[model samples]
Target: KPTIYKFRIALSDMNNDYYDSKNLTIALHPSEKPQRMLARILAFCLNAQKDLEFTKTEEPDLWHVADDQSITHWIEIGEPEPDRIKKASRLAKQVKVYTYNTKAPVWWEKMSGKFSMLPVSVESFDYDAIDMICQHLDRGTNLSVMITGTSIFVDVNDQHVEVTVKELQSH
Candidate 1:
């Protein structure tokens, strides 16, 4: 299984129903920034599955950005690795960080829990973007990735970054 990238674009219309309209974008480059896009997506997906009921319905799409321009190129979504999927699916119902966030934290207690801070919103990827990001990060380079349309921003980080690329492009 080789990794694939996916993307979703939305127009800049306030009332329009799309993900891109909110100014969210993911960029990948070769730098020792210790960033990972897959982890972010996976984290988001994990969070989504916990917060929203329709995140892991089937497969997620991936995308890529053209070097010449930031335009996104759509890709395919491959099946999750059997072993990995099995683990993830098994833990899918477990009360994780996203689930904990459902309840507002106590002012006295630090907001430190798996699901303590739930993402207000999230958008799915198409596969090309996911693969390209995985590659960009795996090369030991840092990529400028951003998640828009949400009240807060989600950036790539070391904890969730994937050091290697896995999976492939397929219909």
Candidate 2:
């Protein structure tokens, strides 16, 4: 079973001077964690592309489909095996993986050298920072996020939190 979480996100990408607000309704599966959901939100902020939609499917965590129904980007969150990246790379023009939590190092090392040959980019977020954001959020609430460089500033109501993102492997 899954619980639905609704978010009204005010997003600003200071890196490229992009600003827009997004209304997101995400389904949180029992198997996933809240930090993971927040990662998805920030991932959208980092890419902020046209036609991107949250699929919440076995297909992809998020995707951008063209008018011709072609998948231009396949976005994934959390821990996906190398084979998963392989499949996503063959199907989309761009692929990215976002990871958070303490296990990130373990997973990254475990999968070391496996992604170098793949056409996918990988990044990791600050786990405790995301956890702090989670604590500031309700199951349904609105928040504002400002992205400058690799820093993510999140403000919920009057409380604020920050996440530092890192690039692991680039496509």
Candidate 3:
């Protein structure tokens, strides 16, 4: 049976002195994998804008920084194809991709040249960091995320997990 996980997140971005609080309820589809869910949460932390939100439909995963009907940021959770990213660059002000797999480096090496000409940013999460956070995922959870510069500190159910945010150069 599919299960719904509830999350209450309190985020503090020391780099920007930004604070946001959110309560989210996400369902684990029968076919959905754990890695993808963790990627989605990390994506949210990276772009914690006031209007950012998970899409009701999972096609894009998350989006934010909107003005009226125009979207400024289009974010994807997995390693999206170059064609899709090029298309997104044309539609939005910025396009960001977050991959949780170990193969991301090889994937990026092959795709970086093509993505260089487009307005896209690629990043990958550490597998160990992903595992740390995944260990705390449950039916309901509370998290506190604090970011200082590129260092990320996540407190999941009182267990602290730290990770670094790295930006891939497109050009």
Candidate 4:
């Protein structure tokens, strides 16, 4: 079988949170303090890019929904097995609970103030939202995954890891 290394390196980079730009604002879960695994993971996913922008409205009315979300690609190693697949499904569901909308005037102004809403039915991380890279690791296949709507990366490593649930209290 052909060997794959670069793709796996990308997967490792993603798993260790090395690709995260660390410049965007992050609102952590109120229940846990920073440095905790959950908080770190949450923050990493929330601010995975150099910058994230949000649109605005001049009238200050509730009718206007801001465009606050952006997407990033996922890096994967080798091929994923059943357990990894299950974990992705679980993570996808859990993420919805913590997802929140952001509104920032600066981001809107920076984007030339062309604030507009995306299509209502467009959900992030559907079949088209991610970039999966496959390669070989230690004679076994590994998968690297990058999730959309945030900067979270998971390395299945052929093991079953449950999506830990935590309560998110907004400030």
Error of 3 at 64 (Å): 3.3
Choose the strongest candidate by TM-score.
2
The lDDT of model 2 is: 0.87
**Of 1 and 4, the candidate ranking higher by lDDT:** 1
Candidate 4 Cα errors over 4 Å, as ranges = 1-42, 50-153
Q: Write the per-residue lDDT of candidate 1 for residues 30-144, one digit (tens) a residue.
A: 5412123444444443233122221212333332334553322221122222333333333333212111111222311342232123321112232333443444343233333
Candidate 4: C-alpha RMSD to true structure equals: 18.6
lDDT of 3 at 41: 82
Question: In candidate 2, how many Å is residue 51 off?
Answer: 2.9
lDDT of 2 by residue, 36-67 (tens): 88888888888885557776346998898887
After superposition, which runs of candidate 1 have C-alpha atoms over 4 Å from their true positions? Answer: 1-124, 150-171
All candidates' TM-scores?
0.23, 0.92, 0.89, 0.21
CA-lDDT, candidates in order: 0.29, 0.87, 0.78, 0.27
Q: Model 3: per-residue lDDT, tens digit, 1-171?
A: 888899899988887778888788888877887768877887787688636688753357787755577777788877778888888888777778888877778888898888787777887777678788888877898988887876678899888988766677542
Error of 4 at 132 (Å): 22
Please state every model's RMSD to the true fold in angstroms. Answer: 18.4, 1.6, 2.1, 18.6
* Worst 10-residue lDDT window, candidate 4: 119-128
Candidate 2: worst-modelled 10 consecutive residues by lDDT: 49-58
Query: Model 2 clash pairs?
Result: none
TM-score of 1: 0.23
Question: Per-residue lDDT tens digits of candidate 4, residues 112-162?
Answer: 222112101111121111212111123332434344322435453553222
Q: In terms of lDDT, which candidate is strongest?
A: 2
